[PDB]
Amino acid sequence: EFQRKLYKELVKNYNPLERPVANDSQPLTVYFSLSLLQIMDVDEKNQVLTTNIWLQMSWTDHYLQWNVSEYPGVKTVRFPDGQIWKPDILLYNSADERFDATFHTNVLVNSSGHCQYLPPGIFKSSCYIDVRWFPFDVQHCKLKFGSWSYGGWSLDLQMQEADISGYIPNGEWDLVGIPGKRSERFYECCKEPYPDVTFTVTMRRRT
Amino acid sequence: EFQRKLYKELVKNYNPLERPVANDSQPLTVYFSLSLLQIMDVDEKNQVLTTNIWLQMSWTDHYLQWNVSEYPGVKTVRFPDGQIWKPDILLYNSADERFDATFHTNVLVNSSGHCQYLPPGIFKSSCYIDVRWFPFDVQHCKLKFGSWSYGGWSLDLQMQEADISGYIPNGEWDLVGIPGKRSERFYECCKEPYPDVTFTVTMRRRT
Amino acid sequence: EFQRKLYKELVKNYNPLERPVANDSQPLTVYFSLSLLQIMDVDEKNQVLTTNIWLQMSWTDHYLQWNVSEYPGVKTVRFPDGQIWKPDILLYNSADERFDATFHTNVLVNSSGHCQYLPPGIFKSSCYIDVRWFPFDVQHCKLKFGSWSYGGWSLDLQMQEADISGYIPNGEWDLVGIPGKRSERFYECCKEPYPDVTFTVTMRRRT
Amino acid sequence: EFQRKLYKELVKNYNPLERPVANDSQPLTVYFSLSLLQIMDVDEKNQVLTTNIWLQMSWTDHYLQWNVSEYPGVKTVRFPDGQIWKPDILLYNSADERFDATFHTNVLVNSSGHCQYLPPGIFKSSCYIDVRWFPFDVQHCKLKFGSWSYGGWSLDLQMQEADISGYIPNGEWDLVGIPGKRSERFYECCKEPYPDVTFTVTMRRRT
Amino acid sequence: EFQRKLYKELVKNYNPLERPVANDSQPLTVYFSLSLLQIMDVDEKNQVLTTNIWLQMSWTDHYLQWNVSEYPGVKTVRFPDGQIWKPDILLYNSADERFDATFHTNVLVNSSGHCQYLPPGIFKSSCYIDVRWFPFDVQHCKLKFGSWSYGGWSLDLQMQEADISGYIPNGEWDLVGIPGKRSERFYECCKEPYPDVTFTVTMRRRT
Amino acid sequence: QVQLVESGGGLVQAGGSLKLSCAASGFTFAHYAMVWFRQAPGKEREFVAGISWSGASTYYASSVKGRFTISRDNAKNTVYLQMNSLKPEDTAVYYVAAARFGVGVDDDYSYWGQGTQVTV
Amino acid sequence: QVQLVESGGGLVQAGGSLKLSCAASGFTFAHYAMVWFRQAPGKEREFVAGISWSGASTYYASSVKGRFTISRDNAKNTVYLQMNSLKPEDTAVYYVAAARFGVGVDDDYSYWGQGTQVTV
Amino acid sequence: QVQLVESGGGLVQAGGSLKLSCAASGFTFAHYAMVWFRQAPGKEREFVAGISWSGASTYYASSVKGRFTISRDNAKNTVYLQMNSLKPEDTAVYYVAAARFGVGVDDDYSYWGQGTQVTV
Amino acid sequence: QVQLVESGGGLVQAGGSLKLSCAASGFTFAHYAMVWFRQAPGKEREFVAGISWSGASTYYASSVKGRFTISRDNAKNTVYLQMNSLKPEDTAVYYVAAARFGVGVDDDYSYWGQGTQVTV
Amino acid sequence: QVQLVESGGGLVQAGGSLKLSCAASGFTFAHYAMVWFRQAPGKEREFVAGISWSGASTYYASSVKGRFTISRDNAKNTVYLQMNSLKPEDTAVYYVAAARFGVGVDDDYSYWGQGTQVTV
Numbered sequence A, B, C, D, E: 001e002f003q004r005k006l007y008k009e010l011v012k013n014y015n016p017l018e019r020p021v022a023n024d025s026q027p028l029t030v031y032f033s034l035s036l037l038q039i040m041d042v043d044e045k046n047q048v049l050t051t052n053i054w055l056q057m058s059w060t061d062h063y064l065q066w067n068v069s070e071y072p073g074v075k076t077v078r079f080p081d082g083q084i085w086k087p088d089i090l091l092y093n094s095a096d097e098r099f100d101a102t103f104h105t106n107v108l109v110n111s112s113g114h115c116q117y118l119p120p121g122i123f124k125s126s127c128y129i130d131v132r133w134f135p136f137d138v139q140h141c142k143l144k145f146g147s148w149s150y151g152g153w154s155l156d157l158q159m160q161e162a163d164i165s166g167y168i169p170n171g172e173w174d175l176v177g178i179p180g181k182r183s184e185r186f187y188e189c190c191k192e193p194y195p196d197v198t199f200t201v202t203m204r205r206r207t
Numbered sequence F, G, H, I, J: 001q002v003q004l005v006e007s008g009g010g011l012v013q014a015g016g017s018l019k020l021s022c023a024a025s026g027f028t029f030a031h032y033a034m035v036w037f038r039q040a041p042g043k044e045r046e047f048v049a050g051i052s053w054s055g056a057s058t059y060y061a062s063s064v065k066g067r068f069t070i071s072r073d074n075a076k077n078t079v080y081l082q083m084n085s086l087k088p089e090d091t092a093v094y095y096v097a098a099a100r101f102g103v104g105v106d107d108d109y110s111y112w113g114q115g116t117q118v119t120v
């Protein structure tokens, strides 16, 4: 059938190791945004923050385009981990023993090649805990995400506002907010930018 | 022998990535129902519910049909994980560090192509704990299951009543019940339904 | 050499997914027996029993027969997990987060095709704990084993008496015994038996 | 180059499942010795001993020989787990949930085919704890190692004295010693020996 | 495209098991340096140090060179674990149950074949804890890194100063420093050096 | 008793018409995509026509599209190749292959027929 | 000393009968599915007949079904091909292949015979 | 209805010029690298020319570089092979292969054309 | 400098005897199973004889067993094929293949010889 | 623009000498092992000579060792085959293959040349 034909054809000449760009001299734009579900633990002895987060990475695979007319009924396609290229966006300041709490789900691609990736995870992040206004302390825990091996001009990481629509309130900490900021950091050797997205969760101790 | 012939033939042209539907423009009906075995833990600080659950997903693989007369003695077949298509039904509000507590068992297919999947698991789910009627509190913990990447018109998720015939009573919580409800949620971009099944376990604190 | 020839030949036409029976209309007899090594933990809040158990499953692979004269010096052969068919015997009432505490060792096959499988494991099983004769209570913890997807007429599960020759006494519980019983359970749709083996460990609280 | 040629040639006709012996009717000699690094935990409620141990298994692969003159500069070769045959030496009385705490490192083979295997591990072993001379008790914890599926006449397990040169003293237990003993155990059916090596760590409680 | 061509060509004749040296009789120089992020735990009963460390290993793959002019826009390439040769640099005195806390990230190679490897990890290392100046004790915890199977003349391990620019201060221990030292150890059988790099973290108890 | 029997071959002049018919037995005809291959005497086999298992997709070789028409009848377990305006290079043994639930172009075939010789 | 010796070939006229017999030695005959392949002089090998290791399944090529009959005798370690009404295209060297516990159609063969020439 | 129709073949003398043109249909032409293969009568197929899917990379066989020029026109879905100074060994059926987003030299082709005979 | 030099070929009458000898160099002869293949002029290569690396297992083709005898001498690094009662179909170029620690029948060969022509 | 141009072929008498030379372009010559293959008219390709990418390992076929000498010059990107005492079976088209960092005997080749005909 048409889905079988499309699945056979889409992997004809496909290397998961290669960035899915038409031109190799321009970056692939990857839109990143997290969804906070609940703050599970705020460890104060070991400066670690444990949260439930659904990542959302959207990019464009130039190699996963097809004609809906030529493939009637098949307007979307799913690819497991390791069969297509995915951004190596990781939490830099992660204190998890495996360092990658994401559950690798399938990547969803539609007819234009737009790939959506929604990894859920229980993220343990390094957060300096300041306890000197103990009964009324406000803490800014930074969740710093970026490509491990790609820099600018190859993987252009763009930011989208995090949504707290599915947030579950905590019995000890009140979520003042979670604003995100995109920053660019530079080596001395090259003028190559290195983008990153930091979501700074602001919490207040509940009294 | 006939079982060897059938196993060789069933995977002649088979892509596990493809939805096993005869027509790609109509959904595959997947019947979902859980079996509660015991409520192991109700964590109140971290709003997490730990339960023993046997999932049951039944669908129809159009590609796994055969003639019992042509294959005498072989009226059933088993396929491990990763060799045939399986629904991506996951617990959305799961607080497990791996996010998928299911143990991937073999899928059982009979002569008409009907596939049965029974994953056991120790599910850690996010449940808001209300403690204000503490000595006589009744809590409604929701177990929300759905396809991670398939929506309506592709994977029609239908509900079957959960059975508590194998339930093991808990020493702290009394199982008032576990009714299930099928809901449909809609995006703004499309009229595409997204089904889900929520089993709301109702528990009473034992005094 | 002869071992190399035998290993190359034994996997000529072999499907691990297929039941190793000469005739597909009669069951394969699998002999099951456990060996208790020590009772590690008896959890009373979470009704879970933790024990060290060496399973022993013996069956006959019709496809792994060879001539000792034609293969001098090679009277036995080892196959890792996933290369030959193994019974899907699991602990039904297991409370382990992975649900399968067995360590998949190699299967040993001799010249007649007799396969021996000895998985060690630290089994966490669901056991209702009755505490009303607390200082002198005797508890019957059931370890229920069976094929996950095979029933009768396909996988005839037979029982052998468990041995406690390697048992290590516990400092809190005295092993009164561990008798096994083979039971058959029936669906309403078919007259197909479903065998299972329940080993009921009987323990007394040590005073 | 010569290393590339040697790596390509060494796996020409190689089955990891086959014992690397020139003659199949005589055993392969495997020399076993452990290195104690530190005693991490002595659990008294659950009769379990936790230690840091580096195993050392040395054997001879008849199939991994080459000419140093024909391969200049290449006098050694490394093979990962699963690509060449390794002895199935396991700790019989292990109380670890995975039952195999060894980290599978690469096997080192030199020009004569001599294979060295050094798996590090944090071994949890079953040890009966006798507490009746509590302030001055000396305990003999046995670490019993043997081939899981090979017996005598196939895998001749020989013992080498354990070294405590890298031992880290414990703050609660004093290492009186760790002598090893090679024992042979016999079935009733056959006269086939089954060798094993037991290292009996002798510890004294520190007062 | 050019990236696709380069990825196809780079693995034409490539064995990950082979040391990427032009001449097999001279060593490959591997530069090693760690980055301390935070000291998470100093266990005193079990003499174990838990730290967050980003390793950095740099070497030269002679087989991963290409012409930037012949491959416009492709000046860098990423290879996952298991597809190209990587140094087997491990923490010798590691007390982790898996013995390897590194998260295997992609290796980055540029046009000259220079390979960079940055494994993050939560390292549990064996450190003798001296408690006799308890309120004012300074402790020297050694992190000993080396090639598990390669020695000198094959893998020349060189040291680079560790950086503490990303260090997160601990609430109980003050990082006096972390100097590194490269040592060479010799067997009696051969004059073959065995290099290792020991980073001795110096910490003071905070009062 | 899986069998694919082809019939309708023979001698034709150029610009003629021939209706090749292949009958299938021993297997579920509706579950298999049915394709036509040809073998010219001293050359290799090549795809001519193919119909999907559902019959909703027909694929023809570029050398033959417009002239040949593949069809299937599941009631009679038959595959038809209606050839119009044959040409001298349309001279070969035509035989039918069956692929389990195949798309109709690139598939792993399970059953092969004997074949009928047609000459132009 | 695995050996498959074929016999019974020779010259026959059209519409004749020939009983080809292959004797096996050096291996367990009852554990192997035994099939007949043919090699025409300037063509490729092709399947003619096949019997399962248990002898309960016989598979014939569409070009030969009804005319050829494969059988096996485990007591004498023999495979028989009884051919009736031979035809000019039934002219080839016929040789026997053995597959370990094979089904009889699609199998990985381990032992091959020499072959006997039959001409029609 | 994937189709690759070649045209422009025929008889030429040595040191001549021929413009072969292949029209594509049924698939996204701009998404496929388009290459030219040749089949001499009693030899095997061999690569002659190839253009990448983006059209920014052209690869020619060593036997033909400088004389043949591959080009593509995505507006008309056409692949052109401009041959100058043909030579007696440039006598074969030339046919076009398409590879999904191929580089242009080593690719897994999906669609094949019929071919045009050129003789020198 | 791996080399396998065959010698002893030539012209023989039917029912004769020939001792083919192959000398090996450049590799450990005792570590390799040494087999004899033949190439008839217009057919494919086929196995004739084979000896294991240890020399304790000899495997002959069914067409040649009883007449041909393979042997090896590790001291001289030589493989011998003693052929008795040759027959017209024993006319081919005989060449020797070496497989690392091979069993002697089904192995992945590493080194190939040139070959000597024998005619009956 | 990867190109391997062979030259130096032609007609020679038996017991002669010929220096075949292949020039490489479009790729790093020092990174590739360069080998010589031959194609006799009605036979298959076979290895003749090979030099490693570093030039420190030369491998010759048993039929040609002692007579042929492979060499490489990285400054001129050239591979030389010096043939002495040619023989009638040394009549074929000789063409050069390149393998990325290949050993020189068993490698996956990336680039192939056109070839020069030599006749003895």
Ligand SMILES: *[C@@H]1O[C@H](CO)[C@@H](O[C@@H]2O[C@H](CO)[C@@H](O)[C@H](O)[C@H]2NC(C)=O)[C@H](O)[C@H]1NC(C)=O
Pocket (backbone or CB within 6 Å): A110, A111, A112, A113, A114, B189
């Ligand atoms: C496939 O998905 C893409 C992305 O969702 C749709 O294209 C537009 O993409 C931009 C961002 O890349 C969005 O802001 C637009 O809202 C998208 N347009 C929509 C949703 O109409 C595209 O439409 C989707 N469908 C097809 C057939 O390509």
Ligand SMILES: *[C@@H]1O[C@H](CO)[C@@H](O[C@@H]2O[C@H](CO)[C@@H](O)[C@H](O)[C@H]2NC(C)=O)[C@H](O)[C@H]1NC(C)=O
Pocket (backbone or CB within 6 Å): B110, B111, B112, B113, B114, C189
């Ligand atoms: C194979 O399994 C199916 C499903 O269990 C059986 O078909 C019916 O399926 C519906 C739901 O899809 C059930 O409600 C019916 O009870 C099933 N009929 C039965 C159980 O008789 C089917 O009968 C089974 N057997 C075969 C040979 O197809």
Ligand SMILES: *[C@@H]1O[C@H](CO)[C@@H](O[C@@H]2O[C@H](CO)[C@@H](O)[C@H](O)[C@H]2NC(C)=O)[C@H](O)[C@H]1NC(C)=O
Pocket (backbone or CB within 6 Å): C110, C111, C112, C113, C114, D189
């Ligand atoms: C191979 O193993 C089998 C099973 O252990 C042996 O056959 C008999 O099997 C039955 C149960 O299936 C046992 O009760 C008998 O004790 C076994 N006979 C023995 C151990 O002599 C068989 O003998 C073993 N050896 C061979 C060569 O087949």
Ligand SMILES: *[C@@H]1O[C@H](CO)[C@@H](O[C@@H]2O[C@H](CO)[C@@H](O)[C@H](O)[C@H]2NC(C)=O)[C@H](O)[C@H]1NC(C)=O
Pocket (backbone or CB within 6 Å): D110, D111, D112, D113, D114, E189
């Ligand atoms: C390769 O390793 C082996 C084993 O280490 C060396 O051979 C001897 O092996 C015995 C035990 O099998 C040791 O007791 C000897 O000390 C070893 N001889 C030595 C170390 O000289 C062998 O020498 C090593 N080298 C080669 C080229 O084979």
Ligand SMILES: *[C@@H]1O[C@H](CO)[C@@H](O[C@@H]2O[C@H](CO)[C@@H](O)[C@H](O)[C@H]2NC(C)=O)[C@H](O)[C@H]1NC(C)=O
Pocket (backbone or CB within 6 Å): A189, E110, E111, E112, E113, E114
């Ligand atoms: C590729 O990376 C290497 C290594 O970073 C660069 O080569 C030099 O390598 C040495 C150490 O091996 C460094 O100390 C130098 O700073 C590097 N030179 C630089 C960074 O200019 C090389 O330049 C990089 N780029 C290319 C095209 O090879």
Ligand SMILES: *[C@@H]1O[C@H](CO)[C@@H](O)[C@H](O)[C@H]1NC(C)=O
Pocket (backbone or CB within 6 Å): A023, A024, A025, A026, H054, H056
């Ligand atoms: C790719 O981008 C470069 C620079 O932006 C440009 O010069 C080139 O024409 C583009 N297209 C290619 C290389 O096909």
Ligand SMILES: *[C@@H]1O[C@H](CO)[C@@H](O)[C@H](O)[C@H]1NC(C)=O
Pocket (backbone or CB within 6 Å): A067, A069, A070, H026
């Ligand atoms: C393929 O897509 C193009 C435009 O996207 C459209 O014109 C064409 O009709 C489609 N193919 C078919 C077979 O309809």
Ligand SMILES: *[C@@H]1O[C@H](CO)[C@@H](O)[C@H](O)[C@H]1NC(C)=O
Pocket (backbone or CB within 6 Å): B023, B024, B025, B026, F054, F056
């Ligand atoms: C599939 O479904 C569509 C819409 O329901 C229908 O038009 C079509 O005929 C069906 N069958 C096919 C595409 O073979």
Ligand SMILES: *[C@@H]1O[C@H](CO)[C@@H](O)[C@H](O)[C@H]1NC(C)=O
Pocket (backbone or CB within 6 Å): B067, B069, B070, F026
């Ligand atoms: C296959 O099934 C059909 C109907 O399901 C039946 O009529 C036929 O007899 C079966 N095949 C055989 C060989 O019996």
Ligand SMILES: *[C@@H]1O[C@H](CO)[C@@H](O)[C@H](O)[C@H]1NC(C)=O
Pocket (backbone or CB within 6 Å): C023, C024, C025, C026, G054, G056
């Ligand atoms: C298999 O068993 C069935 C029923 O017991 C019997 O009829 C048949 O003859 C047996 N043998 C076969 C199918 O080869």
Ligand SMILES: *[C@@H]1O[C@H](CO)[C@@H](O)[C@H](O)[C@H]1NC(C)=O
Pocket (backbone or CB within 6 Å): C067, C069, C070, G026
């Ligand atoms: C194979 O086994 C049979 C009986 O089991 C025996 O008679 C025969 O001798 C054996 N084969 C050989 C070569 O000895």
Ligand SMILES: *[C@@H]1O[C@H](CO)[C@@H](O)[C@H](O)[C@H]1NC(C)=O
Pocket (backbone or CB within 6 Å): D023, D024, D025, D026, I054, I056
């Ligand atoms: C192997 O050992 C057996 C018994 O020790 C002996 O009879 C035989 O000759 C040895 N060599 C072989 C089988 O090649």
Ligand SMILES: *[C@@H]1O[C@H](CO)[C@@H](O)[C@H](O)[C@H]1NC(C)=O
Pocket (backbone or CB within 6 Å): D067, D069, D070, I026
């Ligand atoms: C191979 O080893 C043997 C002895 O081990 C030696 O005589 C010979 O010279 C070596 N090969 C080469 C090419 O040097």
Ligand SMILES: *[C@@H]1O[C@H](CO)[C@@H](O)[C@H](O)[C@H]1NC(C)=O
Pocket (backbone or CB within 6 Å): D072, E023, E024, E025, E026, J054, J056
């Ligand atoms: C490799 O190094 C050795 C020793 O330094 C030298 O003799 C040799 O020429 C070098 N090159 C090779 C082996 O190609």
Ligand SMILES: *[C@@H]1O[C@H](CO)[C@@H](O)[C@H](O)[C@H]1NC(C)=O
Pocket (backbone or CB within 6 Å): E067, E069, E070, J026
């Ligand atoms: C390849 O690199 C060399 C030097 O590194 C350069 O001269 C040459 O121009 C490059 N190739 C191309 C096609 O530019």
